[PDB]
Each structure stands twice: as structure tokens, then as C-alpha cells.
Design an enzyme around this catalytic site. Structure first.
Site, PDB file in Angstrom:
ATOM      1  CG  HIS A   1      -1.910  -1.091   1.269  1.00  0.00           C
ATOM      2  ND1 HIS A   1      -2.045  -1.899   2.388  1.00  0.00           N
ATOM      3  CD2 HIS A   1      -2.768  -1.522   0.308  1.00  0.00           C
ATOM      4  CE1 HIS A   1      -2.976  -2.790   2.082  1.00  0.00           C
ATOM      5  NE2 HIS A   1      -3.453  -2.602   0.841  1.00  0.00           N
TER       6      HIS A   1
ATOM      7  CE  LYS B   1     -13.488  -6.120   1.929  1.00  0.00           C
ATOM      8  NZ  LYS B   1     -12.253  -6.331   1.130  1.00  0.00           N
TER       9      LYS B   1
ATOM     10  NE  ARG C   1      -2.296  -8.446  -4.165  1.00  0.00           N
ATOM     11  CZ  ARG C   1      -3.039  -7.983  -3.163  1.00  0.00           C
ATOM     12  NH1 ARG C   1      -2.528  -7.127  -2.290  1.00  0.00           N
ATOM     13  NH2 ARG C   1      -4.292  -8.391  -3.016  1.00  0.00           N
TER      14      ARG C   1
ATOM     15  CB  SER D   1      -4.306  -6.586   4.636  1.00  0.00           C
ATOM     16  OG  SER D   1      -3.891  -5.273   4.300  1.00  0.00           O
TER      17      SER D   1
END
Ligand SMILES: O=C(O)c1cccc([C@H]2CCC[C@@H]2c2nc3cccc(O)c3[nH]2)c1
Ligand SMILES: O=C(O)c1cccc([C@H]2CCC[C@@H]2c2nc3cccc(O)c3[nH]2)c1
Ligand SMILES: O=C(O)c1cccc([C@H]2CCC[C@@H]2c2nc3cccc(O)c3[nH]2)c1
Lengths: 157, 160, 160, 157, 160, 157
Positions: free
Chosen positions: A16, A40, A89, A127
Site C-alpha cells: 500500500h 469484512k 497485483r 493484508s
């Protein structure tokens, strides 16, 4: 030119930091926007995530860290942003990113979604993966800012 | 910041998808160079001179676009044009693996050049110049995917 | 409803995977046309005449299949044959991005033609005519992937 | 010829209406089959989803809306269906769809799975994305039938 | 168990990505044959003799690697070399669909040959010999991706 | 040469038996390592999964079944393993497998991740799909070892 880099950032990783740093080299003002994301069930509260990201980005002069629980598009309009940054990614991310970007365009057509690619160094982390390793006492110092690593250790202690 | 961006491609021919991408790029960067590759990896339908004139006429309404031919690597061209942004269009049907190879190679060649991926309208998310040319060569209707000047040039090219 | 479906391809040569797909199509549509492309994007191993005869012999046991050569766009052929269904085989190793381009382009050319994706048996989900030809050209055993008549024609073709 | 279009439809979107409409142009009778799907913890009850889909498809003469908690393959056999319709938006869907289709073929080899592609208009939406936007008070009128949009507003009110 | 593994490819030229893969393979199998394909699906930049000498010099420091040219199917070569393991490198930018086709075809041809997928370092996960050659042909810096002997041979090849 | 084949194995399927059998034809000793995986809320306890896998692999002389709650990389170091086996079914798996493999390499660089491809017979199944079918009383005898099928029937009875 004002850009928003929105995300859950639970917690913010070196991947990030890589994206937001690239964003500041392109746009005059960058808002790193942390979504509350209760669905989440985040590890860190919104207040903690904002504090971690503020400390992790203190060295970048044109980054402003803010939290939000609002619809993404409304928060970008309210920040006077015309650019929405997202890191890409791999192929798996690309598909879900397209849905959000087309929805954001439907809700605010002047808000342009732009994708940036992280360094090869951070192309295989997330993460979620960092938290999984840390939950099992695995060393994640390489992947996180110093203050974040401390907070993740302390949170799991 | 006074950012200069390049938008490279073969544009053989330039389509409504390419117009959409370059228009989005002009809304976020001060100067956009629509950069047309001179070289044929595979021999192009339109010559470089034809590709440049078609792209110029089709982007003439966008004040901050310059159409330029180049025969070197897109990273070398970006360096010589003092551009720090490289625009890539990302259709739903893009080869994402190749885009990753290209971005990491461009970063190796010119670290200060940032690859920026833009998304076209859903309308142009499933087309390519390649598909357009195949359809047109086999007598199919492609008018919807092209600027009017390109439609006229493509019909003339296929007639002879 | 008396539905007519086309199943287009180069069928160079027709494999057990293609037989599986066309058999599934005959179980759901009243008439299936196995449509063989005349044109070489890349020069085919078998001529159009060879590809048609092989496909006819291999599907002779299926009463509602007609094998026909065509040299136009698959959408134009479907229109002329009064077909409203276009069959696409979807192996595990298919180029799904290209299938999306093709389906949206076919819908643009002929809106009333519906692209239908069928799945082959797991047995044929990892093969292609291209791979079969590469293996056979380099002296590998491909008998398992082909109808007997195709196996005999392929051995004769490679012998000379 | 009888086809079943099964799914969670929580709630039914314009993308689902697009698929079922295409299905009716191909097959004589189409059963839009709503799976109870408790593991997915749906927003709307099965009864609500059936009612919403019935109203949303009332204009299509050869559509029958039914709910089920049964194994997919058994419900298709019980409906005398030989065609199973599923919509395909992108590569991410294609992989999971293959597993279900091969399992369904194992359980009922005469039930043919067929995939249809929605309009470009609905290629980047899902029930999940529509619910996420609506939970944040974002406008989703473009993506849902009128009766569904009302029910989603009322459910979140 | 005294396992023999083959690592096949065109190696045109051999890159740091290929060196990384073959090094990993020598750490898990007793004998590794780096197998170079003689044939041009597309005409290779370096001849077979050039590709073999470059690969030999670049792997000379690895005691259990043998560099060998072959002109048959990789399954037939593995059989003749009494190898039961076939090494495939899996970069982040690999064509996973083709790898599945290849593995299932190799298993059909030689059931006792097991395809083993190794992962290169992140450093080499976005490169290919193809991309390296394109960059070098268009005057870009590729020194970082190649063994020194390969860098010297590639500059000599492009100079003439 | 010692290889570890780690996973949740909830429950072990014929696809897993296929991979471990291939692994034993390549390496002298194979450790089939069952991760406790509480975050995944497994159907079977770790003790049950170990017992099922032990019985399912009894015919393979060089397989040792063990359970673990440890970090993957630490457990492989503790087993003196230098090879980590994972099965690859399709593109969707390949992306997540890369992240784990690069993280494992970061934590233990001498532990080589190797991927094997299952038989076409098991290329479209997963523990999750088998459980979904069995929860709906669908026949899954084809996909599981005899002892596992019995235990899954008994667990859902
Ligand atoms: O693939 C396209 O979309 C493309 C567009 C315009 C130009 C080109 C080619 C044309 C000749 C050299 C050009 C070129 N290939 C490269 C490879 C890696 C890094 C580079 O900087 C490259 N730049 C390709
Ligand atoms: O790619 C196949 O599987 C294929 C099969 C048969 C035929 C063809 C080609 C052969 C020449 C024109 C044909 C053709 N391309 C098209 C492109 C877009 C829309 C169409 O209707 C097309 N129809 C391709
Ligand atoms: O694609 C590569 O990475 C590749 C590498 C080395 C060699 C080859 C080709 C070269 C000529 C025959 C070789 C060949 N194709 C095959 C197809 C299926 C099964 C086989 O055993 C094959 N073996 C390809």
C-alpha cells in the site's frame, strides 16, 4: 489535481505504501481513504487503521489520511477528487476491480479509476496473508511499516 | 504538476475504444502524446503515414493531444518526450499477464516512468483493432466501432 | 420451437472433443449444422474437402447433423442458414477472453443469434486440434483423441 | 424442451432478467429456480426472492418461478428439465461454473449445462455488488427491476 | 530414490529465470538434464549449437546438470533419458492453460513421467526470453536478466 | 528426501489421494500434514481429519499423516522437509498458491514449493464442493475414499 486511494487497509502494508508513494509522484494531492468496512469484520478499528496509516505516511508531504463509512463515489465527490487509485497485483484482482470501477463510473462519471502496479517486491502480499502469518507467530517485519508491525504484534499479544 | 503522458500503440486502425482511452487521459494529464509504433511485429493494414493521419483527424477535437510516430521502445520514446506517465488501456478482454510483463519491463528501463491503466467504456470493452480488421476483411459491419474518417479509410483499403 | 444451430470451427482435424460437443448439441436442438471454415488464418493441415469428408464420416451416426463448408463470417453463415443458435465448445483450457470478444461481436452482427457454450467431457477438456497436430507431427501417439477415420487420414498425411 | 435457470437470486437483477429472457427465446419452457442457499445467509427470504422474481418476470409468458432447497440435479430431474442455464460474466465465474457443471453431469448426465453471456450493459454487476452499493445508500435503480429496487429500498429502510 | 529430471525448453537465449529454475531443480533431484529443443516452431535467434554452448557455460558451476539438445517430443526424450520428472517453470506471467494441456498430454504419452512446477524468484517472475529478445532488438537494456556469457553473445548477435 | 503435503483436508478427497500418491513416487518420505485451520470453521475436527487421512493412506508405505496448528514453514523445518507439495487444479488456485509459496520461501528459502497436477478425473472437485453436494443428500461415493464417505454420511446423519 486530487486523487483518492481508497481501501480497507487492515492493516496498511508496504504494498500500500508503494502504491500511495507512486500516486504522490503523479498527482498534487493524494487522499489515502480508509473504508470502515464492517462486513469484512476488520482486525483493527477504523480509528486504529487511520492512526497507523497517518504514522506510516508522515514522510510523504502531499498525503492526507482520512476514514469514511460513506459510499466510495460520494466520498470522492466530497473530497473534490477526479482520480480514484487502486493497486493491481494479478488477474484475480483485475476482475473484481473492473466491477467496482464500472459501478463507481455509473455513480460519478467524472471520477476516473486508474490502476497502478506495485513493485515485484510486494506483488505477492496482501493484508490478509500478513495477518494469517502473524496469527501463527510468523515474521512479517519485511512487509509492514515499523509502527504497523509493532501494532500487529501488540494486537495479537 | 505539469504532467506529460504517452499513450502508445500500433493503432491499426485507431478505434472508438482508443478514442475513449485517450479522451480519459486528456481529462487527467496536461499533455497527452498518442504515440504510434512505426514497426510491424506483424505487417500492419495501414501504413504509418495512414495511421498518423487517421489518428490526427479523429483526435483533432482534443486540444491537449499530439499524434507522433515512433520506431524505438515505448520507454525510450517516453524518456525523449520527457513523459513520466505511460497510458495503457485495460479492456475486459486484455492480456493482463502481458500487461504485467510490459509494466515491469518499462519500470526496469525507465524507473521514473509510471504505467497507468485506464478502463474504457463497457461499450468498447470487448473489441480490438485485430477483431475489427478480421470482421471487416470478412465483410462484416464494423461502422459502430470506428470514427467516421477511419470507417471511410477502411472501406477504401478493403475495396482495392 | 424448431431450433437450428450452427457449430462452427476449422475442425483441422475434427477430434473426439468436437464429436462430444456436436453430440451434446444434437440432444438439445432439432437441427445442427457442423460448419467448417474454408479459410486459412494459418494454412490448415487438411484441405477443406478433406476436413468435410472426415467430419461427415465421423458424425454419420448422428441423424440431425449436416456438415457444411463456409467462407464467410460465422454470423453471416448462421443468418443464411436461418440458425438462431451458435454453439461454442468451452474446454477447461479455452481462451475465455477471446470467447467473450467473439460472442459480443456476433451479437453486434446478428442480434437474434444466441451464442451457447457447451462443456466437453473431462476426457477431452485439455486437448485441441493444434496440440493434437503438434504431438502427431513430432511422432507422438494421438489415437485416443481422434475418430478412427481421422486417425487413418492423419497417419497417411504425415507419412508423405 | 424444458430448461432450468437456477441461482440464489438475492435479489434478481437486470443481468438475471437478461439471461432468463435469452433462455425463453431458445427453449419452450423455462423454470427460474431460486435456491434457498442458507450457507450464503441471504438478505431476502426464499419466499421474498420467489415473489420478487415472479413480479419481475410476469411479462415473459413461458417463465415459471419456483423455489427449492433440494440438490440442484434432483430438482432439475423433478422438473423434467434437460437443460441447465447459467450466465457467464467473466473468467472468475467460468472456473467455479465448470466444477458445478461437471458435478451436475456426474449426478444427472442427461442434464446439459449451457452458458449464456449477458449484455455488455450487465457484464460488470452482481447481486452482491448491488447490495453493497444500496447498503451505502447508493443509487441502484439502473440495475434492478422496479419491484426489486422498491423491495431493496424497503428492506434497508 | 535416484531421480532423473529433465528441464526442457527452447532457451533462446537462456535467462536468469531459467538459471534460477534449474538451480532449484538440482537442489531436489539427483540428476537434471537441461534439454534444449532443436526445432523452430518460430525460427530461433540463436542456433541450437549456440543455445547449447551458452547454457553449458551458464550452468558449469552446477555439478549435477547436463545440457543436451533434442529434436523429439519432450515425453519421448524423458523416456530415452530414463527421467521420471519433467520440470516446468511457473512464472507469474505463465500461460497456465497451456501448462495444463501440456501436462495432461505428457501424462497420456508417458504415464510414469510426472510434471513438476517450480516457481522462480519474484525477480524473474515477469520476464521471458521472448520479451528479453524484443527489448534487446529494439535497443533496450537487458543485462540484468542474463548470465554474462549470454549478454556478450546477444550483443554480438545484434551487432551484425 | 522428505516432502510435506500440507492442507486443511476437510475431508481428504480422491483428488488429495491422487496428489499424495504422485508425491510418494517422487520422494522417499511424504508427510501428509493436516492444518487445524480454525478460521475456515472445518466440518471435521483435526483429530477426525487425521484419522480419516491415516485410514485413507494406509496402503501407501512412505506416507506419514500428522496434524499441526503451527506456521506452515516452521512445521516443514521441524519435519526436516525441503519440499512442499501442493496440487494445482486451475488458474483460480494458481494465483493464491503463488502468494503462499512466496511467503513460505521468505520464511524458509530452502523449502521448495512444487506443484503437481491431479488426474483429469479429479480436476473439477474440492472438499467444499463434495460437502455442498453431501449436505443436500447428493451421492459423492465416486469422489471420496470409502472410510471418508462413511464418516461424511455419519457426520451429516
Ligand atoms: O505492445 C504494445 O502495446 C506496443 C505498443 C507500442 C510499441 C510497441 C513496440 C514496437 C517496437 C518496440 C515497442 C516496444 N516493445 C516493448 C517491450 C517492452 C518495453 C517497451 O518499452 C517496449 N516498446 C509495443
Ligand atoms: O474463431 C473461430 O472459432 C472461428 C470458427 C469458424 C470461422 C472463423 C472465421 C474464419 C473466417 C471468418 C470467420 C469468423 N471470424 C469472426 C470474428 C467475429 C465474428 C464472426 O462471426 C466471425 N467469423 C473463426
Ligand atoms: O512448449 C515447450 O515448453 C516446449 C519445450 C521443449 C520442446 C517443445 C517441443 C519442440 C518440438 C516437440 C516438443 C514438444 N511439444 C510437445 C507437446 C506435447 C507434449 C510433448 O511432450 C511435447 N514436446 C516444446
Amino acid at each position: 489535481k486530487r486523487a483518492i486511494y481508497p481501501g480497507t487497509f487492515d492493516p496498511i502494508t508496504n504494498g500500500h505504501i508503494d502504491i500511495v508513494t507512486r500516486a504522490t509522484q503523479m498527482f498534487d494531492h493524494v487522499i489515502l481513504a480508509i473504508a470502515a468496512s464492517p462486513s469484512k469484520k476488520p482486525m483493527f478499528t477504523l480509528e486504529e487503521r487511520v492512526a497507523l496509516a497517518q504514522q506510516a505516511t508522515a514522510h510523504l508531504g502531499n498525503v492526507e489520511v482520512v476514514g469514511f463509512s460513506d459510499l466510495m463515489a460520494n466520498f470522492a465527490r466530497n473530497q473534490h477528487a477526479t482520480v480514484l487509485i487502486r493497486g493491481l497485483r494479478a488477474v484475480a484482482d483485475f476482475e473484481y476491480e473492473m466491477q467496482l470501477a464500472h459501478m463507481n463510473r455509473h455513480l460519478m462519471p467524472e471520477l476516473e479509476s486508474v490502476f497502478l502496479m506495485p513493485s515485484k517486491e510486494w506483488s505477492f502480499i496482501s493484508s490478509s496473508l500478513v495477518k494469517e502469518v502473524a496469527r501463527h507467530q510468523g515474521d512479517v517485519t519485511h512487509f509492514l511499516p515499523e509502527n504497523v508491525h509493532q501494532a500487529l504484534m501488540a494486537k495479537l499479544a
